[PDB]
Amino acid sequence: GSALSEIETRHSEIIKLENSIRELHDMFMDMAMLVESQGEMIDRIEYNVEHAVDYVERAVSD
Amino acid sequence: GSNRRLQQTQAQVDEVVDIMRVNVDKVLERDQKL
Amino acid sequence: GSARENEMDENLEQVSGIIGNLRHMALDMGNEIDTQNRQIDRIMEKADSNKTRIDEANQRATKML
Amino acid sequence: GSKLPDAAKKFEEAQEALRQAEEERKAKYAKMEAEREAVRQGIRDKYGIK
Amino acid sequence: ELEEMQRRADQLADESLESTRRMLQLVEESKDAGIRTLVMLDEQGEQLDRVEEGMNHINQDMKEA
């Protein structure tokens, strides 16, 4: 009872807190994982653009 | 007592969790656009 | 045993702190990403417009010769 | 006599090198799209957005 | 009876403590992750602005045609 229970309940409540952190953390990881990957795709649109620029730009000046 | 400080903490998280969910969502819409 | 809990209580403090930080971090990402998502929406409209523009363009250039 | 039906084989081998590059590169992009849409969903469920 | 209650309680408490420890690594990593996440989004912001400028230069030239 009140001696041991006060614990057990504090203990329980902590697991709640951990699992919340767990999720939170998980979300933070995936988040990075995606923005990492997206960064890559993006710098390819940097490649695609930088080119299309050189091309059309150079195909005007007379 | 310090228990109250644990309640608080949890809230503080559950808040952020929700926030982030939404942000992950946003990001999915982003990843899609690429 | 107060020593035990005292370490516990200082761990939670410490945590609670960092969860602070992560809050802000979250909020910031959010608002900022939206911004970018807005930017990407633009770029999609512009590229679609240059599709239509470069296609009708070479049709006149090769229509000349 | 003249000995150049090979240049036909040299350049025809090049041309299938071009067929390989772009028709495969098109197929590889198709599957990566689908399989990262898988990833996109996998996690979407992980957290239950809709 | 009561002897086993206090031993019990001692283990339950430690488990909890170890969790605080565990919570802590989690939160650390989450932050690092947050920061890196942001660095990325920030420089990605630059790039995109450059990409927008690119799409504009096109708007200008094809306007000359």
Short mmCIF file of all heavy atoms in Angstrom, two decimals, chain A:
data_model
loop_
_atom_site.label_atom_id
_atom_site.label_comp_id
_atom_site.label_asym_id
_atom_site.label_seq_id
_atom_site.Cartn_x
_atom_site.Cartn_y
_atom_site.Cartn_z
N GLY A 1 0.85 -1.23 0.00
CA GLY A 1 0.00 0.00 0.00
C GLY A 1 0.86 1.24 0.00
O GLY A 1 1.99 1.21 -0.51
N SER A 2 0.33 2.32 0.58
CA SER A 2 0.84 3.70 0.36
C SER A 2 2.38 3.84 0.26
O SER A 2 2.85 4.61 -0.56
CB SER A 2 0.26 4.66 1.41
OG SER A 2 -1.05 5.09 1.03
N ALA A 3 3.15 3.12 1.05
CA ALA A 3 4.60 3.08 0.84
C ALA A 3 4.97 2.63 -0.59
O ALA A 3 5.45 3.41 -1.43
CB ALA A 3 5.24 2.15 1.87
N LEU A 4 4.71 1.35 -0.85
CA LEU A 4 5.06 0.71 -2.11
C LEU A 4 4.23 1.17 -3.30
O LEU A 4 4.75 1.33 -4.41
CB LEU A 4 4.91 -0.81 -1.95
CG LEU A 4 4.86 -1.69 -3.20
CD1 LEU A 4 5.45 -3.06 -2.90
CD2 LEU A 4 3.44 -1.81 -3.74
N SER A 5 2.94 1.38 -3.09
CA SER A 5 2.11 1.85 -4.16
C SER A 5 2.63 3.19 -4.65
O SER A 5 2.88 3.33 -5.84
CB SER A 5 0.68 1.99 -3.70
OG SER A 5 0.59 3.10 -2.83
N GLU A 6 2.80 4.17 -3.75
CA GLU A 6 3.20 5.52 -4.18
C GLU A 6 4.32 5.39 -5.16
O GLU A 6 4.41 6.14 -6.13
CB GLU A 6 3.71 6.39 -3.04
CG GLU A 6 2.65 7.17 -2.25
CD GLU A 6 3.21 7.69 -0.90
OE1 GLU A 6 4.35 8.22 -0.88
OE2 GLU A 6 2.52 7.56 0.13
N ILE A 7 5.18 4.42 -4.90
CA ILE A 7 6.21 4.07 -5.87
C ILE A 7 5.58 3.52 -7.14
O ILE A 7 5.53 4.20 -8.15
CB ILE A 7 7.19 3.05 -5.31
CG1 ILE A 7 7.91 3.65 -4.11
CG2 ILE A 7 8.16 2.63 -6.40
CD1 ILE A 7 9.10 2.85 -3.68
N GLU A 8 5.10 2.29 -7.09
CA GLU A 8 4.54 1.64 -8.27
C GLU A 8 3.83 2.60 -9.22
O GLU A 8 4.01 2.50 -10.43
CB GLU A 8 3.53 0.58 -7.85
CG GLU A 8 4.16 -0.71 -7.36
CD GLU A 8 3.13 -1.73 -6.92
OE1 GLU A 8 1.96 -1.34 -6.70
OE2 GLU A 8 3.50 -2.93 -6.81
N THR A 9 3.03 3.51 -8.68
CA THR A 9 2.33 4.51 -9.49
C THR A 9 3.34 5.51 -10.06
O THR A 9 3.26 5.85 -11.23
CB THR A 9 1.22 5.26 -8.71
OG1 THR A 9 1.82 6.11 -7.73
CG2 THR A 9 0.24 4.30 -8.04
N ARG A 10 4.28 6.00 -9.26
CA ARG A 10 5.31 6.85 -9.84
C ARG A 10 6.02 6.10 -10.96
O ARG A 10 6.28 6.63 -12.03
CB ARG A 10 6.32 7.31 -8.79
CG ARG A 10 7.21 8.52 -9.22
CD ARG A 10 8.17 8.97 -8.12
NE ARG A 10 9.06 7.89 -7.67
CZ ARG A 10 10.10 8.04 -6.84
NH1 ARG A 10 10.41 9.23 -6.32
NH2 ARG A 10 10.84 6.98 -6.51
N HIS A 11 6.32 4.85 -10.70
CA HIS A 11 7.01 4.04 -11.68
C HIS A 11 6.20 3.97 -12.98
O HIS A 11 6.68 4.38 -14.04
CB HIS A 11 7.26 2.66 -11.08
CG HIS A 11 7.46 1.58 -12.09
ND1 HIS A 11 8.71 1.16 -12.49
CD2 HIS A 11 6.58 0.81 -12.77
CE1 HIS A 11 8.59 0.19 -13.38
NE2 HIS A 11 7.30 -0.04 -13.56
N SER A 12 4.97 3.47 -12.90
CA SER A 12 4.06 3.46 -14.03
C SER A 12 4.10 4.77 -14.82
O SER A 12 4.40 4.77 -16.01
CB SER A 12 2.64 3.24 -13.54
OG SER A 12 1.71 3.69 -14.51
N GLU A 13 3.81 5.87 -14.14
CA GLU A 13 3.82 7.19 -14.76
C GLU A 13 5.08 7.49 -15.53
O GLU A 13 5.04 8.18 -16.54
CB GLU A 13 3.67 8.27 -13.71
CG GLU A 13 2.22 8.53 -13.37
CD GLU A 13 2.05 9.64 -12.34
OE1 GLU A 13 2.59 9.51 -11.21
OE2 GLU A 13 1.36 10.64 -12.66
N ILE A 14 6.20 6.97 -15.05
CA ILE A 14 7.46 7.14 -15.77
C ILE A 14 7.49 6.42 -17.12
O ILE A 14 7.94 6.97 -18.14
CB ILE A 14 8.62 6.69 -14.92
CG1 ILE A 14 8.85 7.75 -13.87
CG2 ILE A 14 9.87 6.48 -15.75
CD1 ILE A 14 10.00 7.46 -12.98
N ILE A 15 7.01 5.18 -17.13
CA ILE A 15 6.91 4.46 -18.39
C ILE A 15 6.07 5.26 -19.38
O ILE A 15 6.42 5.36 -20.57
CB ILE A 15 6.29 3.06 -18.21
CG1 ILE A 15 7.15 2.22 -17.27
CG2 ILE A 15 6.15 2.39 -19.56
CD1 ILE A 15 6.66 2.28 -15.83
N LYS A 16 4.97 5.83 -18.90
CA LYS A 16 4.21 6.67 -19.78
C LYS A 16 5.17 7.69 -20.37
O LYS A 16 5.26 7.84 -21.58
CB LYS A 16 3.04 7.35 -19.09
CG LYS A 16 2.05 7.91 -20.08
CD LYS A 16 0.89 8.66 -19.43
CE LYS A 16 0.03 9.38 -20.51
NZ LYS A 16 -0.98 10.33 -19.96
N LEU A 17 5.90 8.38 -19.51
CA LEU A 17 6.77 9.44 -19.98
C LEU A 17 7.81 8.95 -20.96
O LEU A 17 8.11 9.65 -21.93
CB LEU A 17 7.49 10.11 -18.82
CG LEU A 17 8.25 11.35 -19.30
CD1 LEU A 17 7.27 12.43 -19.72
CD2 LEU A 17 9.19 11.86 -18.23
N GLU A 18 8.37 7.77 -20.72
CA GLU A 18 9.42 7.26 -21.61
C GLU A 18 8.82 7.04 -22.98
O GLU A 18 9.32 7.52 -24.00
CB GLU A 18 10.03 5.97 -21.07
CG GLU A 18 11.10 5.35 -21.99
CD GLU A 18 11.88 4.17 -21.34
OE1 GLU A 18 12.33 4.29 -20.17
OE2 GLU A 18 12.04 3.11 -21.99
N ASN A 19 7.72 6.30 -23.03
CA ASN A 19 7.10 6.00 -24.31
C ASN A 19 6.77 7.22 -25.11
O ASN A 19 6.75 7.17 -26.33
CB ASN A 19 5.87 5.14 -24.12
CG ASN A 19 6.25 3.72 -23.89
OD1 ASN A 19 6.26 3.24 -22.75
ND2 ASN A 19 6.59 3.03 -24.97
N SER A 20 6.51 8.32 -24.42
CA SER A 20 6.24 9.56 -25.07
C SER A 20 7.52 10.04 -25.66
O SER A 20 7.57 10.54 -26.78
CB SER A 20 5.74 10.55 -24.07
OG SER A 20 4.94 9.85 -23.15
N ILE A 21 8.59 9.90 -24.91
CA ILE A 21 9.85 10.41 -25.40
C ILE A 21 10.24 9.57 -26.59
O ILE A 21 10.69 10.07 -27.62
CB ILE A 21 10.91 10.35 -24.33
CG1 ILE A 21 10.71 11.54 -23.40
CG2 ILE A 21 12.28 10.36 -24.96
CD1 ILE A 21 11.09 11.19 -22.01
N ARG A 22 10.04 8.27 -26.42
CA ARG A 22 10.39 7.34 -27.44
C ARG A 22 9.79 7.82 -28.75
O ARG A 22 10.51 8.09 -29.69
CB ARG A 22 9.87 5.96 -27.07
CG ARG A 22 10.29 4.88 -28.05
CD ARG A 22 11.75 4.52 -27.88
NE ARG A 22 12.06 4.02 -26.54
CZ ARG A 22 13.27 3.61 -26.16
NH1 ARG A 22 14.29 3.62 -27.02
NH2 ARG A 22 13.47 3.18 -24.92
N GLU A 23 8.47 7.92 -28.79
CA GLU A 23 7.82 8.45 -29.96
C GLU A 23 8.47 9.74 -30.35
O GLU A 23 8.94 9.87 -31.48
CB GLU A 23 6.35 8.72 -29.69
CG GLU A 23 5.48 7.56 -30.02
CD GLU A 23 4.90 7.66 -31.41
OE1 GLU A 23 4.04 8.54 -31.63
OE2 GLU A 23 5.30 6.85 -32.28
N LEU A 24 8.53 10.69 -29.45
CA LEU A 24 9.03 11.99 -29.87
C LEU A 24 10.34 11.83 -30.64
O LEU A 24 10.48 12.27 -31.79
CB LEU A 24 9.23 12.93 -28.69
CG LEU A 24 9.48 14.36 -29.19
CD1 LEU A 24 8.14 15.11 -29.30
CD2 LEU A 24 10.51 15.14 -28.34
N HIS A 25 11.30 11.19 -29.99
CA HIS A 25 12.59 10.90 -30.58
C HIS A 25 12.44 10.27 -31.94
O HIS A 25 13.02 10.72 -32.90
CB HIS A 25 13.35 9.95 -29.67
CG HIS A 25 14.48 9.26 -30.35
ND1 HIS A 25 14.36 7.99 -30.89
CD2 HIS A 25 15.76 9.64 -30.57
CE1 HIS A 25 15.52 7.64 -31.41
NE2 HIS A 25 16.39 8.62 -31.23
N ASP A 26 11.64 9.22 -32.01
CA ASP A 26 11.42 8.55 -33.28
C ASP A 26 11.02 9.54 -34.36
O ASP A 26 11.56 9.51 -35.47
CB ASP A 26 10.34 7.47 -33.16
CG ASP A 26 10.90 6.14 -32.67
OD1 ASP A 26 11.95 6.14 -31.97
OD2 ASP A 26 10.27 5.11 -32.98
N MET A 27 10.09 10.42 -34.04
CA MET A 27 9.68 11.44 -34.99
C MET A 27 10.86 12.33 -35.41
O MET A 27 10.99 12.69 -36.58
CB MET A 27 8.55 12.28 -34.41
CG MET A 27 7.31 11.46 -34.12
SD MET A 27 5.92 12.44 -33.49
CE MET A 27 6.00 13.80 -34.66
N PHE A 28 11.70 12.69 -34.44
CA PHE A 28 12.85 13.53 -34.73
C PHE A 28 13.83 12.85 -35.63
O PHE A 28 14.50 13.49 -36.43
CB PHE A 28 13.56 13.96 -33.44
CG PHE A 28 13.08 15.25 -32.93
CD1 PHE A 28 12.28 15.32 -31.83
CD2 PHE A 28 13.41 16.42 -33.59
CE1 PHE A 28 11.82 16.55 -31.38
CE2 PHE A 28 12.96 17.62 -33.14
CZ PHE A 28 12.16 17.69 -32.04
N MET A 29 13.94 11.55 -35.50
CA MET A 29 14.89 10.86 -36.32
C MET A 29 14.32 10.88 -37.72
O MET A 29 14.93 11.44 -38.63
CB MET A 29 15.14 9.44 -35.79
CG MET A 29 15.83 9.43 -34.41
SD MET A 29 17.36 10.40 -34.30
CE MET A 29 18.44 9.43 -35.37
N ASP A 30 13.15 10.28 -37.90
CA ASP A 30 12.60 10.14 -39.24
C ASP A 30 12.67 11.49 -39.92
O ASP A 30 13.16 11.61 -41.03
CB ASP A 30 11.17 9.59 -39.20
CG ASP A 30 11.13 8.12 -38.76
OD1 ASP A 30 11.93 7.30 -39.28
OD2 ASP A 30 10.29 7.79 -37.90
N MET A 31 12.19 12.52 -39.23
CA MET A 31 12.28 13.89 -39.72
C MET A 31 13.61 14.20 -40.41
O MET A 31 13.65 14.57 -41.58
CB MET A 31 12.07 14.86 -38.57
CG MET A 31 12.15 16.29 -38.99
SD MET A 31 11.16 16.59 -40.49
CE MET A 31 9.46 16.58 -39.89
N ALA A 32 14.70 14.05 -39.68
CA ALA A 32 16.03 14.25 -40.25
C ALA A 32 16.28 13.37 -41.46
O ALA A 32 16.75 13.85 -42.49
CB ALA A 32 17.06 13.95 -39.23
N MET A 33 15.96 12.09 -41.32
CA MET A 33 16.11 11.09 -42.39
C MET A 33 15.50 11.56 -43.69
O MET A 33 16.10 11.40 -44.76
CB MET A 33 15.44 9.79 -41.97
CG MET A 33 15.47 8.68 -43.00
SD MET A 33 14.92 7.12 -42.31
CE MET A 33 16.29 6.64 -41.24
N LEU A 34 14.32 12.15 -43.59
CA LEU A 34 13.63 12.67 -44.75
C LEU A 34 14.27 13.92 -45.27
O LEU A 34 14.51 14.02 -46.46
CB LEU A 34 12.18 12.97 -44.42
CG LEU A 34 11.37 11.72 -44.08
CD1 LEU A 34 9.87 12.02 -44.27
CD2 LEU A 34 11.82 10.50 -44.92
N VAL A 35 14.54 14.89 -44.40
CA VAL A 35 15.12 16.14 -44.90
C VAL A 35 16.53 15.91 -45.44
O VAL A 35 16.96 16.59 -46.37
CB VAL A 35 15.13 17.26 -43.84
CG1 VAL A 35 16.19 18.30 -44.18
CG2 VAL A 35 13.77 17.90 -43.76
N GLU A 36 17.26 14.97 -44.86
CA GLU A 36 18.48 14.50 -45.49
C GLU A 36 18.21 14.05 -46.93
O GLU A 36 18.88 14.51 -47.87
CB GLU A 36 19.09 13.35 -44.68
CG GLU A 36 20.44 12.84 -45.21
CD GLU A 36 21.03 11.75 -44.33
OE1 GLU A 36 20.27 11.12 -43.56
OE2 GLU A 36 22.25 11.51 -44.41
N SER A 37 17.23 13.16 -47.11
CA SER A 37 16.99 12.58 -48.43
C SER A 37 16.50 13.65 -49.40
O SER A 37 16.89 13.67 -50.56
CB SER A 37 15.97 11.44 -48.38
OG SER A 37 14.65 11.92 -48.55
N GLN A 38 15.65 14.53 -48.91
CA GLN A 38 15.06 15.55 -49.74
C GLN A 38 16.13 16.50 -50.20
O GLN A 38 16.13 16.91 -51.35
CB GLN A 38 13.95 16.28 -48.99
CG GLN A 38 12.67 15.45 -48.95
CD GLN A 38 11.66 15.96 -47.96
OE1 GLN A 38 10.57 16.41 -48.34
NE2 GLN A 38 12.00 15.89 -46.68
N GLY A 39 17.05 16.85 -49.31
CA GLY A 39 18.19 17.69 -49.67
C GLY A 39 18.82 17.18 -50.94
O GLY A 39 19.15 17.95 -51.84
N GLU A 40 19.00 15.86 -51.00
CA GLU A 40 19.64 15.25 -52.15
C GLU A 40 18.83 15.50 -53.43
O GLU A 40 19.33 16.15 -54.33
CB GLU A 40 19.87 13.76 -51.91
CG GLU A 40 20.76 13.54 -50.69
CD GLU A 40 21.24 12.12 -50.57
OE1 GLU A 40 20.52 11.20 -51.03
OE2 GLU A 40 22.34 11.92 -50.02
N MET A 41 17.60 15.02 -53.50
CA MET A 41 16.75 15.36 -54.63
C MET A 41 16.88 16.83 -55.04
O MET A 41 16.96 17.15 -56.22
CB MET A 41 15.30 15.13 -54.29
CG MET A 41 14.85 13.71 -54.37
SD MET A 41 13.05 13.70 -54.42
CE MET A 41 12.77 14.36 -56.07
N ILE A 42 16.91 17.72 -54.05
CA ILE A 42 16.89 19.15 -54.34
C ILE A 42 18.13 19.51 -55.11
O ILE A 42 18.01 20.07 -56.20
CB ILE A 42 16.81 20.02 -53.07
CG1 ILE A 42 15.36 20.43 -52.78
CG2 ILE A 42 17.63 21.30 -53.23
CD1 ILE A 42 14.36 19.32 -52.81
N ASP A 43 19.30 19.19 -54.59
CA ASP A 43 20.53 19.58 -55.29
C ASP A 43 20.61 18.98 -56.72
O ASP A 43 21.45 19.42 -57.51
CB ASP A 43 21.78 19.24 -54.46
CG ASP A 43 21.82 17.80 -54.03
OD1 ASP A 43 21.75 16.91 -54.90
OD2 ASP A 43 21.92 17.55 -52.81
N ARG A 44 19.76 18.01 -57.04
CA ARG A 44 19.59 17.56 -58.42
C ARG A 44 18.76 18.55 -59.22
O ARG A 44 19.05 18.79 -60.38
CB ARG A 44 18.94 16.18 -58.51
CG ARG A 44 19.87 15.05 -58.15
CD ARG A 44 19.20 13.69 -58.31
NE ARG A 44 20.00 12.61 -57.72
CZ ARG A 44 19.62 11.33 -57.63
NH1 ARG A 44 18.43 10.94 -58.09
NH2 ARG A 44 20.44 10.44 -57.08
N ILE A 45 17.73 19.12 -58.63
CA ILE A 45 17.01 20.20 -59.31
C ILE A 45 17.90 21.45 -59.44
O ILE A 45 17.69 22.27 -60.33
CB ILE A 45 15.67 20.54 -58.62
CG1 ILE A 45 14.73 19.32 -58.67
CG2 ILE A 45 15.04 21.75 -59.28
CD1 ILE A 45 13.26 19.64 -59.01
N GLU A 46 18.89 21.57 -58.56
CA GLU A 46 19.95 22.57 -58.72
C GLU A 46 20.77 22.26 -59.98
O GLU A 46 21.07 23.16 -60.76
CB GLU A 46 20.84 22.59 -57.48
CG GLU A 46 21.89 23.71 -57.43
CD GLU A 46 23.09 23.36 -56.53
OE1 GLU A 46 23.03 22.34 -55.80
OE2 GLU A 46 24.10 24.10 -56.57
N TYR A 47 21.14 20.99 -60.15
CA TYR A 47 21.83 20.52 -61.37
C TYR A 47 20.98 20.78 -62.61
O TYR A 47 21.46 21.39 -63.56
CB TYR A 47 22.15 19.02 -61.25
CG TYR A 47 23.24 18.44 -62.15
CD1 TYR A 47 24.58 18.47 -61.76
CD2 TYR A 47 22.92 17.82 -63.37
CE1 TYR A 47 25.59 17.92 -62.58
CE2 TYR A 47 23.92 17.27 -64.19
CZ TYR A 47 25.24 17.33 -63.78
OH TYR A 47 26.22 16.79 -64.58
N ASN A 48 19.73 20.33 -62.60
CA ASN A 48 18.82 20.53 -63.73
C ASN A 48 18.61 21.99 -64.08
O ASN A 48 18.57 22.34 -65.26
CB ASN A 48 17.46 19.88 -63.48
CG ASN A 48 17.42 18.41 -63.87
OD1 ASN A 48 18.46 17.74 -63.91
ND2 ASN A 48 16.23 17.89 -64.16
N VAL A 49 18.47 22.84 -63.08
CA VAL A 49 18.29 24.26 -63.34
C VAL A 49 19.57 24.92 -63.86
O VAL A 49 19.59 25.48 -64.96
CB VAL A 49 17.81 25.01 -62.10
CG1 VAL A 49 18.05 26.52 -62.25
CG2 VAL A 49 16.34 24.70 -61.87
N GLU A 50 20.64 24.86 -63.06
CA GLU A 50 21.92 25.45 -63.45
C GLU A 50 22.26 25.19 -64.93
O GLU A 50 22.78 26.08 -65.61
CB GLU A 50 23.04 24.94 -62.54
CG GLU A 50 23.08 25.61 -61.16
CD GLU A 50 24.20 25.10 -60.25
OE1 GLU A 50 24.69 23.97 -60.46
OE2 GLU A 50 24.58 25.84 -59.32
N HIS A 51 21.96 23.99 -65.41
CA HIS A 51 22.12 23.64 -66.83
C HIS A 51 21.17 24.44 -67.71
O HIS A 51 21.61 25.27 -68.52
CB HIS A 51 21.91 22.14 -67.07
CG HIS A 51 23.10 21.29 -66.72
ND1 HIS A 51 24.37 21.57 -67.17
CD2 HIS A 51 23.20 20.17 -65.96
CE1 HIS A 51 25.21 20.65 -66.71
NE2 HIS A 51 24.52 19.80 -65.97
N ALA A 52 19.87 24.19 -67.56
CA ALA A 52 18.85 24.86 -68.37
C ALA A 52 19.14 26.36 -68.50
O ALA A 52 18.86 26.97 -69.54
CB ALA A 52 17.47 24.61 -67.78
N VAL A 53 19.71 26.95 -67.45
CA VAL A 53 20.15 28.36 -67.49
C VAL A 53 21.27 28.58 -68.49
O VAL A 53 21.13 29.38 -69.41
CB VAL A 53 20.64 28.85 -66.11
CG1 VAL A 53 21.52 30.09 -66.27
CG2 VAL A 53 19.46 29.14 -65.20
N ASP A 54 22.39 27.88 -68.30
CA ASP A 54 23.53 27.99 -69.21
C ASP A 54 23.08 27.83 -70.65
O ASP A 54 23.48 28.60 -71.52
CB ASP A 54 24.60 26.93 -68.90
CG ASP A 54 25.41 27.25 -67.66
OD1 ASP A 54 24.87 27.93 -66.75
OD2 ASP A 54 26.58 26.83 -67.59
N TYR A 55 22.25 26.82 -70.89
CA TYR A 55 21.75 26.56 -72.24
C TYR A 55 20.99 27.76 -72.81
O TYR A 55 21.45 28.37 -73.78
CB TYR A 55 20.90 25.27 -72.28
CG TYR A 55 21.76 24.03 -72.40
CD1 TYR A 55 22.27 23.39 -71.27
CD2 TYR A 55 22.08 23.51 -73.65
CE1 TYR A 55 23.06 22.26 -71.38
CE2 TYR A 55 22.88 22.37 -73.77
CZ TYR A 55 23.36 21.75 -72.63
OH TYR A 55 24.15 20.63 -72.77
N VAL A 56 19.84 28.12 -72.24
CA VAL A 56 19.02 29.18 -72.85
C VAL A 56 19.73 30.55 -72.89
O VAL A 56 19.69 31.26 -73.91
CB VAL A 56 17.66 29.34 -72.15
CG1 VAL A 56 16.84 30.47 -72.78
CG2 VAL A 56 16.89 28.02 -72.21
N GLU A 57 20.38 30.90 -71.78
CA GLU A 57 21.19 32.12 -71.69
C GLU A 57 22.16 32.23 -72.87
O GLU A 57 22.20 33.26 -73.55
CB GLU A 57 21.98 32.14 -70.38
CG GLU A 57 22.83 33.39 -70.15
CD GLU A 57 24.07 33.11 -69.32
OE1 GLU A 57 23.94 32.48 -68.24
OE2 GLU A 57 25.17 33.52 -69.74
N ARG A 58 22.94 31.18 -73.11
CA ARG A 58 23.97 31.18 -74.16
C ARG A 58 23.33 31.18 -75.56
O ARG A 58 23.93 31.68 -76.52
CB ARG A 58 24.93 29.99 -73.99
CG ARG A 58 26.27 30.13 -74.71
CD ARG A 58 27.31 29.13 -74.19
NE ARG A 58 26.82 27.75 -74.22
CZ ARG A 58 26.78 26.96 -75.29
NH1 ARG A 58 27.21 27.40 -76.48
NH2 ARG A 58 26.31 25.72 -75.19
N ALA A 59 22.11 30.64 -75.66
CA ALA A 59 21.37 30.58 -76.93
C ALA A 59 20.51 31.83 -77.20
O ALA A 59 19.40 31.71 -77.74
CB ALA A 59 20.49 29.33 -76.97
N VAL A 60 21.01 33.01 -76.81
CA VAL A 60 20.35 34.29 -77.14
C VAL A 60 21.29 35.42 -77.64
O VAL A 60 20.93 36.15 -78.57
CB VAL A 60 19.54 34.84 -75.93
CG1 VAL A 60 18.71 36.05 -76.34
CG2 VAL A 60 18.65 33.76 -75.34
N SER A 61 22.47 35.54 -77.03
CA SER A 61 23.33 36.74 -77.17
C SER A 61 23.93 36.98 -78.58
O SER A 61 24.92 36.35 -78.95
CB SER A 61 24.47 36.65 -76.14
OG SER A 61 25.27 37.82 -76.15
N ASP A 62 23.32 37.90 -79.34
CA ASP A 62 23.86 38.38 -80.63
C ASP A 62 23.66 39.88 -80.78
O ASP A 62 22.65 40.32 -81.31
CB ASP A 62 23.21 37.65 -81.81
CG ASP A 62 23.93 36.37 -82.19
OD1 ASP A 62 25.18 36.38 -82.30
OD2 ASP A 62 23.23 35.35 -82.39
#
